[PDB]
């Protein structure tokens, strides 16, 4: 579509389409995040929090 | 900024319909809005993307307010006095700029701004084409059918809309159908300027009939006027310029096909062909068609005339509701009337009797002599000096003393005007309560004097409907005058 050339081509954001697949908290339960674990295979460059 | 933004902007089928500067400005405005949304501070910036380069340079504008809040986007000369006040307060010129905006987390906002800019570009193209061309006044196919409304899409991204009053009161439109309407107002609505049409004028019917009339197409007969009204009247008439042509045949077309075609565009009203004549006396009868030639009336200078017709055809010729009278008022260039021959005869007899009675008391002649002199013709004893002597003195006998009725009247006009002028001197003489009231015309004093009202209390007691019976003064003006008088009477404590 011309909107594609208007948006992703001009801005350079060539990801370009995204879909929400975040691990949302299951409904009905509260909580407090006490421990977070990050396991990364040694092929991918780990981010700042890792 | 790599020789790609301009190429993306130039479609050039639809995106680059206007100059590349406008598209670049719209895209840069969307980018600036996205950056401002991403920016923590509520600053205002404007971006400009050159078509040759593509690098969108963003400069933060000032828009200086007369307050001290938000110094990054609103300042005054008092705060600038530290910097010697190089610029006066209230300046909206640019005073800041931003290096570059990442615009990564704001991708959804940028997409929404791009959609809004696409809608704005569609509206701009609609304004550039339909609004500059006053819409598309042509037959089309309806696309949307809203409640008593039809929206149609035309070529070159043009659009049109049909009002509820513009369509038939009983007929309802549906998508994909055909709606006839001449666009005359392209209102700049959101998401395109939908043209507005109204089927309430004879211009559309005249234009429709002219194309399908061989006489009009060949310029043999020229149409002088046309009359049409949705649900009231619709007649087609053309005038032959001494070319020996039939007006009814020219207006009807080829075996009535033109009338049938125009009937659909006229809101379902049947289209009838009437004759046209150059002489107004003949033109009234010609435009009275379908009827018979029984209405004859002439006037000296005024355009007013009377219409006489048979009792059976009294409703077909004009009609008490005007079902054809609007034709005679329009397609003939003369006044129309809805009555019978008896009414016209009674009016003529009453006018003759009034003229005879006035002449009897204005000329001091004997009653029998005045009646004999006035029975030769209507309004004979009136304006003898102004009218030609061949009419006021056609009969023999007292031809020499005929000019006496004007010679005496020339001197006695001062006494004649006394009854018209000094009648209000004793009967409800004007006062400052009503005659001097602000917001009224000079005829208000005469109306008050002729209605018997002299004091403001009587006017204040009455409302608007009671005073609306007089056609000279509207109900609103009388009500406003009464309210002003009542307010003055209530609050005359202060001078």
UniProtKB/Swiss-Prot annotation, chain A:
This is DNA-directed RNA polymerase subunit beta. The gene is rpoB. It comes from Escherichia coli O157:H7. DNA-dependent RNA polymerase catalyzes the transcription of DNA into RNA using the four ribonucleoside triphosphates as substrates. It comes from the Bacteria. The RNAP catalytic core consists of 2 alpha, 1 beta, 1 beta' and 1 omega subunit. When a sigma factor is associated with the core the holoenzyme is formed, which can initiate transcription. Belongs to the RNA polymerase beta chain family.
From Swiss-Prot, chain B:
Residues 1-137 are annotated as: N-terminal domain (NTD) interacts with RNAP. GO terms for biological process: DNA-templated transcription termination; protein complex oligomerization; regulation of DNA-templated transcription elongation; ribosome biogenesis; transcription antitermination. PROSITE patterns: KH_TYPE_1 (PS50084), S1 (PS50126). Residues 345-426 are annotated as: Acidic repeat 1 (AR1). GO terms for molecular function: bacterial-type RNA polymerase core enzyme binding; DNA-binding transcription factor activity; nucleotide binding; protein domain specific binding; RNA binding. Residues 364-489 are annotated as: 2 X 51 AA approximate repeats. Sequence repeats lie at residues 364-414, 439-489. Monomer. Binds directly to the core enzyme of the DNA-dependent RNA polymerase (RNAP). Interacts with nascent RNA. Interacts with the termination Rho factor. Interacts with the phage lambda N protein. Interacts with SuhB via the AR2 domain, crystallizes as a 2:1 SuhB:NusA heterotrimer. The rRNA transcription and antitermination complex (rrnTAC) consists of RNAP, NusA, NusB, NusE (rpsJ), NusG, SubB, ribosomal protein S4, DNA and precursor rRNA; S4 is more flexible than other subunits. NusG and the alpha-CTD of RNAP interact with the AR2 domain. The N-terminal region interacts with RNAP. The central region is composed of 3 RNA binding domains, S1, KH 1 and KH 2. The C-terminal region contains 2 acidic repeats, AR1 and AR2, which bind to protein N from phage lambda during antitermination. AR2 interacts with SuhB and RNAP alpha subunit C-terminal domain (rpoA); AR2 cannot bind to both simultaneously. SuhB, NusG and the alpha-CTD of RNAP all interact with the AR2 domain and can displace the AR2 domain from the SSK domain (S1, KH1 and KH2) of NusA. Belongs to the NusA family. Part of the processive rRNA transcription and antitermination complex (rrnTAC). The complex forms an RNA-chaperone ring around the RNA exit tunnel of RNA polymerase (RNAP). It supports rapid transcription and antitermination of rRNA operons, cotranscriptional rRNA folding, and annealing of distal rRNA regions to allow correct ribosome biogenesis. Participates in both transcription termination and antitermination. Involved in a variety of cellular termination and antitermination processes, such as Rho-dependent transcriptional termination and intrinsic termination. This is Transcription termination/antitermination protein NusA. The gene is nusA.
């Amino acid at each position: 579509t011309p909107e594609e050339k208007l948006l992703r081509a001009i801005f350079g954001e060539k990801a370009s389409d995204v879909k929400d697949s975040s691990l949302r908290v299951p409904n009905g339960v509260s909580g407090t995040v006490i421990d977070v674990q990050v396991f990364t295979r040694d092929g991918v460059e780990k981010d700042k929090r890792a | 900024m790599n020789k790609e933004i301009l190429a993306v902007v130039e479609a050039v089928s639809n995106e680059k319909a206007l100059p590349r500067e406008k598209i670049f400005e719209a895209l840069e405005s969307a980018l600036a809005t996205a950056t401002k949304k991403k920016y923590e501070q509520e600053i205002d910036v404007r971006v400009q993307i050159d078509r040759k380069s593509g690098d969108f340079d963003t400069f933060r504008r000032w828009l200086v307010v007369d307050e001290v809040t938000q110094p990054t986007k609103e300042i005054t000369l008092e705060a600038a006095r530290y910097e010697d006040e190089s610029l006066n307060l209230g300046d909206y010129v640019e005073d800041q700029i931003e290096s570059v905006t990442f615009d990564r987390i704001t991708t959804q906002t940028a997409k929404q701004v791009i959609v809004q800019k696409v809608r704005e570009a569609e509206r701009a193209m609609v304004v550039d084409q339909f609004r500059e061309h006053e819409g598309e006044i042509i037959t089309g196919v309806v696309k949307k059918v809203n409640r008593d409304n039809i929206s149609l899409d035309l070529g070159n991204n043009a659009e049109a809309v049909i009002l509820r009053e513009d369509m038939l009161p009983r007929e309802n439109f549906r998508p994909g159908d055909r709606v006839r309407g001449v666009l005359y107002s392209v209102r700049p609505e959101a998401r395109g300027a939908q043209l507005f049409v109204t089927r309430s004028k004879p211009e559309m019917l005249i234009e429709l009939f002219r194309i399908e009339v061989p006489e009009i197409g060949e310029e043999v007969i020229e149409i002088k006027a046309a009359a049409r009204d949705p649900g009231s009247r619709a007649k087609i008439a053309v005038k032959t310029n001494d070319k020996r042509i039939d007006p009814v045949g020219a207006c009807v077309g080829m075996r009535g096909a033109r009338v049938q075609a125009v009937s659909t565009e006229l809101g379902g009203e049947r289209i009838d062909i009437v004759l046209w004549d150059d002489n107004p006396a003949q033109f009234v009868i010609n435009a009275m068609a379908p009827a018979d030639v029984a209405s004859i009336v002439v006037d000296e200078d005024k355009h007013t005339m009377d219409i006489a017709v048979e009792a059976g055809n009294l409703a077909q010729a004009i009609g008490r509701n005007g079902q054809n009278v609007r034709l005679a008022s329009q397609l003939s260039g003369w006044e129309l009337n809805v009555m019978t021959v008896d009414d016209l005869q009674a009016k003529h007899q009453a006018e003759a009797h009034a003229a005879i009675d006035t002449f009897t008391k204005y000329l001091d002649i004997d009653e029998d002599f005045a009646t004999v002199l006035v029975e030769e013709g209507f309004s004979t004893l009136e304006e003898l000096a102004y009218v030609p002597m061949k009419e006021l003195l056609e009969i023999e006998g007292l031809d020499e003393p005929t000019v006496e009725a004007l010679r005496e009247r020339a001197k006695n006009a001062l006494a004649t005007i006394a009854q018209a002028q000094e009648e209000s001197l004793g009967d409800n003489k004007p006062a400052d309560d009503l005659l001097n009231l602000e917001g009224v015309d000079r005829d208000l004093a005469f109306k008050l004097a002729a209605r018997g009202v002299c004091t403001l209390e009587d006017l204040a007691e009455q409302g608007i409907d009671d005073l609306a019976d007089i056609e000279g003064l509207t109900d609103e003006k009388a009500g406003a005058l009464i309210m002003a008088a009542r307010n003055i009477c209530w609050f005359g404590d202060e001078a």
